[PDB]
Amino acid sequence: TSQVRQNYHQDSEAAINRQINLELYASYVYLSMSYYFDRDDVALKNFAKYFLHQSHEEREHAEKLMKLQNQRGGRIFLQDIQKPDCDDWESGLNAMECALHLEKNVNQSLLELHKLATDKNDPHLCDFIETHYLNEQVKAIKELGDHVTNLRKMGAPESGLAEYLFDKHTLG
Amino acid sequence: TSQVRQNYHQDSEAAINRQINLELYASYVYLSMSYYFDRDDVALKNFAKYFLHQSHEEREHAEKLMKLQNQRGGRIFLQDIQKPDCDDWESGLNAMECALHLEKNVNQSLLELHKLATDKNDPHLCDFIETHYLNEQVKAIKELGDHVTNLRKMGAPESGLAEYLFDKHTLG
Amino acid sequence: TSQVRQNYHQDSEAAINRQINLELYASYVYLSMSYYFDRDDVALKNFAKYFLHQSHEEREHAEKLMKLQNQRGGRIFLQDIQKPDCDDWESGLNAMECALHLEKNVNQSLLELHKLATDKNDPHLCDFIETHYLNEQVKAIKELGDHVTNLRKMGAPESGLAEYLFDKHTLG
Amino acid sequence: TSQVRQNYHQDSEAAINRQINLELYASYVYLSMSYYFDRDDVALKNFAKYFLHQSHEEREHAEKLMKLQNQRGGRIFLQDIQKPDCDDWESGLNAMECALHLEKNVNQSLLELHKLATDKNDPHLCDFIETHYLNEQVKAIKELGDHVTNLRKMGAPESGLAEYLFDKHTLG
Amino acid sequence: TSQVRQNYHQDSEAAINRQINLELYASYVYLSMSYYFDRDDVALKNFAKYFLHQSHEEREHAEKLMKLQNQRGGRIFLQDIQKPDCDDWESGLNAMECALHLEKNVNQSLLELHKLATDKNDPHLCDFIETHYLNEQVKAIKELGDHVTNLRKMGAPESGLAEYLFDKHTLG
Amino acid sequence: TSQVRQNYHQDSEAAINRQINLELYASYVYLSMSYYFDRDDVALKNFAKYFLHQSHEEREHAEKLMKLQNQRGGRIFLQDIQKPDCDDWESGLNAMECALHLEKNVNQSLLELHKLATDKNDPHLCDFIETHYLNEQVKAIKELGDHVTNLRKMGAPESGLAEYLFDKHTLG
């Protein structure tokens, strides 16, 4: 047992590890979408840049858990980062919906991590999920609900005139 | 009776109080309009910005009438601010049409206020409504018919391609 | 139902929708207080500036809850804004008292709102109350208790020499 | 009872005062260590400058609480500060080992203060500990574990060459 | 015996160790006074900001002595820090008075340290007390006599109008 | 058979995807080593900062190949990122020893990739390896050889005085 471990339950330690893997998987998925729009037969230069900057952030979310995992006294345990379910994301409106489905499945995991943190009476881990993740996940899910709504109203995905202009005026 | 009241009729004091309620109601409408556009299923951000800035300018109008009330010996009497007629504003072309319809019934309230101030031989109250409100109300009514007409010609509301671009290039 | 709604209980959506009302009713009272001290037979301009800024913050309080709703996927349902039951505020000591009695009632509402939030396992809505409202309320109450204790200790309300001196050195 | 006290349970009041005395004690301990390393037969410069800083920091934690008590409506009652359990701290490794044992005891105390804050339905006191203490303890406890780990790996306290080189290159 | 100790007598060594304890006891008193005026039922802001600084100073006085003790080749022995004689300081005139009697009792001690350093033919230990404490204490006792004289002539403690106006114009 | 594909043999496209995985497998190893030397019982920061930056570079090596696959009509096929064979890397000498064994194995992969690129008459791919990778790999291998040599020559891993001194002057 580490000399700095204090009020750090063993079930809370394994949950952080599985959260580390989930955010890494999210970093892979956003990278997968990023370079689908980089293709010549799609070529939405700003969807590639949006989904790339979001693949930079999830890689940054997982480094902050390993930081905390080392602070509280646990030991990080890495697993395989699975491959994304899709290699072709069809269109932009389809990708923006699977990301909203992705951050809704990550928010539920942060929302299952927190209830365990309260049951284990771990007040420091609570306010860590509280401050750095839940307040951002709500904004991001509100962000991807935004774009999907506009894309749908603009006549997506059947009218490519919508994808090009939205790419310039929203993600530009 | 206030020691500074001079050429200030009791019917004029009552009328300004009605105007203060109508200015306050006007802002409360713009508010309900703004955060309908902020919804994740309407998703227009510059329509939220436009109707929030206009919500700021209607309080500043109501505050400049209370500043005028204390100046001339009158006393402010506050009534409730009724809730707006609607919570859902349908679409962008509809909201711009209800605001033109709104600043047209406040312009009457000023034109019926100025008719009173002239029938009371009240030159200063006349000139204050003239300099800080009528010149602005016509400028605002001229603006909303401008926005209303372009949405009409673009194809609004049935072509969501319109509202998106109008939000970007006119209200941006 | 909204796409971006997740772990957002309908009781919590209703509870925020009443807290939006209360925060706006707080900006109304401070408004009336502000322009009471601008009255010529009151003639304390720093007391007016103090309540005029606090009436512009309780407005910034209500705007964020409206932002928070659309974030969580709720829906705003605005109701009427009750008038302040007072239109003459006696003096400066009685105005600071009613605001101290007011900000405690806003605190007591935010506490009951957080009690409900702790129930329906919504630890996001929890912190949002915690971070931006709870500690700021405790400061607002302490600051008011500082001004009420002062005014009493010097000669309020039976000595206007006190009210004048407090207006120029404290809120100046 | 105070004009500002609200939802403040009397057990929370006395517990804040006990936490006040512990934070002042941690300041009297870190000071006793500092001027032990200033001694001519010890003569480790940055060892004194780092414990002096940590005796300045724990002091500021105490005000924050004394500032909090007045904020909520309790009364600051204070008792004596006990002398440190040691007048001669052996070595730098033994000092960092006594300091690591100190912070975990303070963390322990805050962790039981949170358990009592939640037990009394006191949300504002809950996060005041969460925001300002529960994270800075873990950041401090993890750090002291690094100082103990690196000193030990260098051959302390048997090799004075270690405590020298570690004073210049880590705490310099 | 230390390799740097020279002409440092054992009586004067233990005397400084008491003088170290006596100046810490002063810091804990100004600390108690400061956050008594921060209370919501007193609320004299710069009374707290003044007494807080005087605590910040007497703490520095103690460190300089713990600096001297190591310089002269003594060994710092610490004792408990007594709690102040009160926890409610009634008024500013009564708090300023308990400071004038506190600061004179501190001079009395230094006055009996200088004779104790003169009798032992320790020409350094005398000039140290001479340069750094004997003059500044005289400066502090004369100022304290000015605040008491002004507060009494104003009408303290009976006229709260006094301690308010004194707070703003003297310590402000 | 994308409109931009030209002189891109099908085996060359497949071998790039194989390299994409290996480059991301390389990044995922240095991230494991990084947050090993941040553990409280290792406490070598510059070691954790060194492996983090090189993890971020093996990242950048991977996106460039994903860029290359799209600019020549190839298509990206992602596979799982394997977990590193180690979760605890013994010491600092061992981690740099495994990293030297890692880059030699990635270098060996690029050399075979260049040999295939020669067999298929693909003079563009033959240089993307030479310019942006082949000279990068030797500098990496040559640098890690300098670190392994120095660590061994001081007394690593049986001397902890070594790894600490190497962490502060080399990678610092």
Short mmCIF file of N, CA and C in Angstrom, two decimals, chain D residues 4-100:
data_model
loop_
_atom_site.label_atom_id
_atom_site.label_comp_id
_atom_site.label_asym_id
_atom_site.label_seq_id
_atom_site.Cartn_x
_atom_site.Cartn_y
_atom_site.Cartn_z
N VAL D 4 -27.11 36.77 10.45
CA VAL D 4 -26.68 36.17 9.19
C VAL D 4 -26.63 34.65 9.25
N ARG D 5 -26.78 34.04 10.42
CA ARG D 5 -26.67 32.59 10.52
C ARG D 5 -27.84 31.92 9.81
N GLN D 6 -27.52 30.88 9.04
CA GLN D 6 -28.54 30.17 8.28
C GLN D 6 -28.03 28.78 7.93
N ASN D 7 -28.83 27.76 8.24
CA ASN D 7 -28.52 26.36 7.95
C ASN D 7 -27.16 25.95 8.52
N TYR D 8 -26.70 26.65 9.55
CA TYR D 8 -25.41 26.40 10.17
C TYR D 8 -25.65 25.64 11.47
N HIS D 9 -25.31 24.35 11.47
CA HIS D 9 -25.56 23.52 12.64
C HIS D 9 -24.44 23.73 13.66
N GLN D 10 -24.79 23.65 14.94
CA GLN D 10 -23.86 24.01 16.01
C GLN D 10 -22.67 23.06 16.08
N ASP D 11 -22.85 21.81 15.66
CA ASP D 11 -21.72 20.88 15.58
C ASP D 11 -20.73 21.30 14.50
N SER D 12 -21.23 21.87 13.40
CA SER D 12 -20.35 22.37 12.36
C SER D 12 -19.54 23.57 12.86
N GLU D 13 -20.14 24.40 13.72
CA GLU D 13 -19.44 25.55 14.27
C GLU D 13 -18.24 25.12 15.12
N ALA D 14 -18.48 24.25 16.10
CA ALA D 14 -17.40 23.81 16.97
C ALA D 14 -16.34 23.02 16.21
N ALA D 15 -16.75 22.30 15.16
CA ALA D 15 -15.77 21.54 14.38
C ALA D 15 -14.87 22.46 13.57
N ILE D 16 -15.40 23.59 13.10
CA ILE D 16 -14.57 24.55 12.38
C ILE D 16 -13.51 25.13 13.30
N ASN D 17 -13.88 25.38 14.56
CA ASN D 17 -12.94 25.92 15.54
C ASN D 17 -11.85 24.92 15.87
N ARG D 18 -12.20 23.64 15.99
CA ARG D 18 -11.19 22.62 16.23
C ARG D 18 -10.26 22.50 15.03
N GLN D 19 -10.81 22.58 13.82
CA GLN D 19 -9.97 22.61 12.63
C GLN D 19 -9.08 23.85 12.60
N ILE D 20 -9.53 24.94 13.22
CA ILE D 20 -8.71 26.15 13.28
C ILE D 20 -7.45 25.89 14.10
N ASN D 21 -7.61 25.24 15.26
CA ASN D 21 -6.47 24.99 16.15
C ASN D 21 -5.48 24.02 15.52
N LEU D 22 -5.97 23.05 14.74
CA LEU D 22 -5.07 22.09 14.11
C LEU D 22 -4.24 22.76 13.02
N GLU D 23 -4.84 23.69 12.28
CA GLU D 23 -4.09 24.37 11.23
C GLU D 23 -3.04 25.31 11.82
N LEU D 24 -3.36 25.95 12.95
CA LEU D 24 -2.36 26.76 13.64
C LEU D 24 -1.25 25.90 14.22
N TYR D 25 -1.60 24.70 14.70
CA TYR D 25 -0.58 23.77 15.19
C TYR D 25 0.36 23.34 14.07
N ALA D 26 -0.19 23.04 12.90
CA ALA D 26 0.66 22.68 11.76
C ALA D 26 1.58 23.83 11.37
N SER D 27 1.20 25.07 11.70
CA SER D 27 2.07 26.20 11.44
C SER D 27 3.19 26.29 12.47
N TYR D 28 2.88 25.97 13.73
CA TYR D 28 3.90 25.98 14.76
C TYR D 28 4.86 24.80 14.62
N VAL D 29 4.44 23.73 13.96
CA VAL D 29 5.31 22.58 13.73
C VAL D 29 6.29 22.88 12.60
N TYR D 30 5.77 23.31 11.44
CA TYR D 30 6.63 23.60 10.30
C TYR D 30 7.65 24.67 10.64
N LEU D 31 7.29 25.63 11.49
CA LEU D 31 8.25 26.62 11.95
C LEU D 31 9.36 25.99 12.78
N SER D 32 8.99 25.06 13.68
CA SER D 32 9.98 24.41 14.54
C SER D 32 10.98 23.61 13.71
N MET D 33 10.51 23.04 12.60
CA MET D 33 11.41 22.34 11.69
C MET D 33 12.33 23.32 10.97
N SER D 34 11.80 24.47 10.55
CA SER D 34 12.58 25.40 9.73
C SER D 34 13.84 25.85 10.45
N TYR D 35 13.68 26.42 11.64
CA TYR D 35 14.81 26.91 12.42
C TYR D 35 15.57 25.79 13.11
N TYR D 36 15.24 24.53 12.84
CA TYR D 36 16.17 23.46 13.15
C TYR D 36 17.17 23.24 12.02
N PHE D 37 16.77 23.48 10.77
CA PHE D 37 17.66 23.36 9.63
C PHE D 37 18.54 24.59 9.43
N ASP D 38 18.23 25.70 10.10
CA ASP D 38 19.07 26.89 10.11
C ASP D 38 20.25 26.75 11.06
N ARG D 39 20.22 25.75 11.94
CA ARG D 39 21.26 25.57 12.93
C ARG D 39 22.62 25.37 12.26
N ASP D 40 23.68 25.74 12.98
CA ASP D 40 25.02 25.69 12.41
C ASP D 40 25.52 24.25 12.25
N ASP D 41 25.01 23.32 13.06
CA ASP D 41 25.36 21.91 12.93
C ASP D 41 24.45 21.15 11.97
N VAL D 42 23.59 21.86 11.25
CA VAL D 42 22.69 21.24 10.27
C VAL D 42 22.91 21.94 8.93
N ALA D 43 22.55 23.23 8.88
CA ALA D 43 23.01 24.13 7.82
C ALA D 43 22.50 23.73 6.44
N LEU D 44 21.23 23.36 6.35
CA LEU D 44 20.58 23.08 5.08
C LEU D 44 19.67 24.26 4.74
N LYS D 45 20.08 25.07 3.77
CA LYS D 45 19.41 26.33 3.47
C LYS D 45 17.97 26.14 3.00
N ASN D 46 17.79 25.52 1.84
CA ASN D 46 16.45 25.41 1.27
C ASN D 46 15.53 24.55 2.12
N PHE D 47 16.08 23.67 2.95
CA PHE D 47 15.25 22.95 3.91
C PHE D 47 14.52 23.92 4.82
N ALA D 48 15.21 24.97 5.28
CA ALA D 48 14.56 25.96 6.12
C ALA D 48 13.61 26.84 5.31
N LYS D 49 14.00 27.18 4.08
CA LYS D 49 13.17 28.06 3.25
C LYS D 49 11.91 27.35 2.77
N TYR D 50 11.95 26.02 2.64
CA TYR D 50 10.76 25.28 2.22
C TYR D 50 9.80 25.03 3.37
N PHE D 51 10.31 24.76 4.57
CA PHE D 51 9.42 24.62 5.72
C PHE D 51 8.89 25.97 6.19
N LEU D 52 9.69 27.02 6.07
CA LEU D 52 9.19 28.37 6.36
C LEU D 52 8.02 28.71 5.46
N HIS D 53 8.11 28.36 4.17
CA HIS D 53 7.00 28.60 3.25
C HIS D 53 5.77 27.80 3.66
N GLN D 54 5.96 26.55 4.08
CA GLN D 54 4.83 25.71 4.46
C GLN D 54 4.25 26.10 5.81
N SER D 55 5.03 26.76 6.67
CA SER D 55 4.47 27.37 7.86
C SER D 55 3.76 28.68 7.55
N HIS D 56 4.12 29.34 6.45
CA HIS D 56 3.36 30.50 5.98
C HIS D 56 2.06 30.07 5.32
N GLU D 57 2.05 28.90 4.70
CA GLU D 57 0.88 28.45 3.97
C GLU D 57 -0.20 27.94 4.92
N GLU D 58 0.18 27.09 5.88
CA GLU D 58 -0.78 26.53 6.82
C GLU D 58 -1.42 27.64 7.65
N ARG D 59 -0.65 28.68 7.96
CA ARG D 59 -1.19 29.87 8.61
C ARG D 59 -2.34 30.46 7.80
N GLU D 60 -2.12 30.66 6.49
CA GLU D 60 -3.17 31.25 5.65
C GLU D 60 -4.40 30.36 5.56
N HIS D 61 -4.23 29.04 5.67
CA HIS D 61 -5.39 28.15 5.78
C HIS D 61 -6.22 28.46 7.02
N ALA D 62 -5.57 28.93 8.09
CA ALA D 62 -6.30 29.19 9.33
C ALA D 62 -7.19 30.43 9.21
N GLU D 63 -6.68 31.51 8.61
CA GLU D 63 -7.50 32.71 8.38
C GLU D 63 -8.75 32.36 7.59
N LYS D 64 -8.54 31.70 6.45
CA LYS D 64 -9.61 31.23 5.57
C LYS D 64 -10.75 30.63 6.37
N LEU D 65 -10.42 29.87 7.42
CA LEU D 65 -11.45 29.31 8.28
C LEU D 65 -12.02 30.37 9.22
N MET D 66 -11.14 31.15 9.86
CA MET D 66 -11.61 32.27 10.68
C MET D 66 -12.38 33.28 9.85
N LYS D 67 -12.05 33.39 8.56
CA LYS D 67 -12.86 34.21 7.68
C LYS D 67 -14.20 33.54 7.39
N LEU D 68 -14.22 32.21 7.35
CA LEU D 68 -15.45 31.48 7.07
C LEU D 68 -16.43 31.52 8.25
N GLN D 69 -15.92 31.40 9.48
CA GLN D 69 -16.79 31.40 10.65
C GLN D 69 -17.63 32.67 10.73
N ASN D 70 -16.98 33.83 10.57
CA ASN D 70 -17.71 35.09 10.58
C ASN D 70 -18.66 35.17 9.39
N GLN D 71 -18.29 34.57 8.26
CA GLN D 71 -19.15 34.58 7.09
C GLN D 71 -20.48 33.90 7.37
N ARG D 72 -20.46 32.78 8.10
CA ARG D 72 -21.66 31.98 8.26
C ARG D 72 -22.51 32.39 9.45
N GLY D 73 -21.92 32.99 10.48
CA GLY D 73 -22.66 33.41 11.65
C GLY D 73 -22.30 32.71 12.94
N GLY D 74 -21.22 31.93 12.96
CA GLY D 74 -20.71 31.36 14.19
C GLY D 74 -19.84 32.36 14.93
N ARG D 75 -19.13 31.85 15.93
CA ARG D 75 -18.25 32.67 16.75
C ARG D 75 -16.89 32.00 16.88
N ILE D 76 -15.84 32.76 16.60
CA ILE D 76 -14.48 32.24 16.64
C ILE D 76 -14.03 32.15 18.10
N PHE D 77 -13.97 30.93 18.61
CA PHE D 77 -13.39 30.62 19.90
C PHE D 77 -12.09 29.86 19.66
N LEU D 78 -11.03 30.25 20.35
CA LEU D 78 -9.70 29.71 20.11
C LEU D 78 -9.03 29.34 21.42
N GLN D 79 -8.30 28.22 21.41
CA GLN D 79 -7.53 27.74 22.55
C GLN D 79 -6.05 27.74 22.20
N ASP D 80 -5.23 27.30 23.15
CA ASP D 80 -3.78 27.40 23.01
C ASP D 80 -3.28 26.55 21.84
N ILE D 81 -2.07 26.87 21.40
CA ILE D 81 -1.37 26.09 20.38
C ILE D 81 -0.32 25.24 21.09
N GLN D 82 -0.43 23.93 20.93
CA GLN D 82 0.50 23.02 21.59
C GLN D 82 1.87 23.10 20.95
N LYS D 83 2.90 22.82 21.75
CA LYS D 83 4.25 22.81 21.21
C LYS D 83 4.48 21.55 20.39
N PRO D 84 5.34 21.62 19.37
CA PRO D 84 5.63 20.42 18.58
C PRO D 84 6.17 19.30 19.45
N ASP D 85 5.88 18.07 19.03
CA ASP D 85 6.31 16.89 19.78
C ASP D 85 7.82 16.70 19.77
N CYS D 86 8.55 17.49 18.99
CA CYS D 86 10.00 17.37 18.89
C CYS D 86 10.63 18.76 18.89
N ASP D 87 11.81 18.85 19.51
CA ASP D 87 12.66 20.03 19.41
C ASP D 87 13.86 19.82 18.50
N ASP D 88 14.18 18.57 18.17
CA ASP D 88 15.31 18.22 17.32
C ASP D 88 14.84 17.17 16.32
N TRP D 89 14.81 17.54 15.04
CA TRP D 89 14.17 16.74 14.01
C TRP D 89 15.14 15.80 13.29
N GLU D 90 16.22 15.41 13.96
CA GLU D 90 17.11 14.35 13.49
C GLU D 90 17.77 14.67 12.15
N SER D 91 17.01 14.60 11.06
CA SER D 91 17.56 14.76 9.72
C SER D 91 16.48 15.33 8.80
N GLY D 92 16.86 15.53 7.54
CA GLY D 92 15.89 15.98 6.56
C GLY D 92 14.89 14.91 6.19
N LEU D 93 15.36 13.66 6.07
CA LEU D 93 14.45 12.55 5.79
C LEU D 93 13.48 12.33 6.94
N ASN D 94 13.97 12.39 8.18
CA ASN D 94 13.09 12.26 9.33
C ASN D 94 12.13 13.44 9.44
N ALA D 95 12.55 14.62 8.99
CA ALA D 95 11.66 15.78 9.02
C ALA D 95 10.55 15.65 7.99
N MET D 96 10.91 15.33 6.74
CA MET D 96 9.90 15.10 5.71
C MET D 96 9.00 13.93 6.07
N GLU D 97 9.53 12.96 6.83
CA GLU D 97 8.72 11.84 7.28
C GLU D 97 7.72 12.26 8.36
N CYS D 98 8.13 13.20 9.23
CA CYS D 98 7.20 13.74 10.22
C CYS D 98 6.19 14.68 9.59
N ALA D 99 6.57 15.37 8.51
CA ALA D 99 5.65 16.27 7.83
C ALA D 99 4.62 15.51 7.02
N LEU D 100 5.04 14.43 6.34
CA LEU D 100 4.07 13.57 5.66
C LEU D 100 3.05 13.02 6.65
#
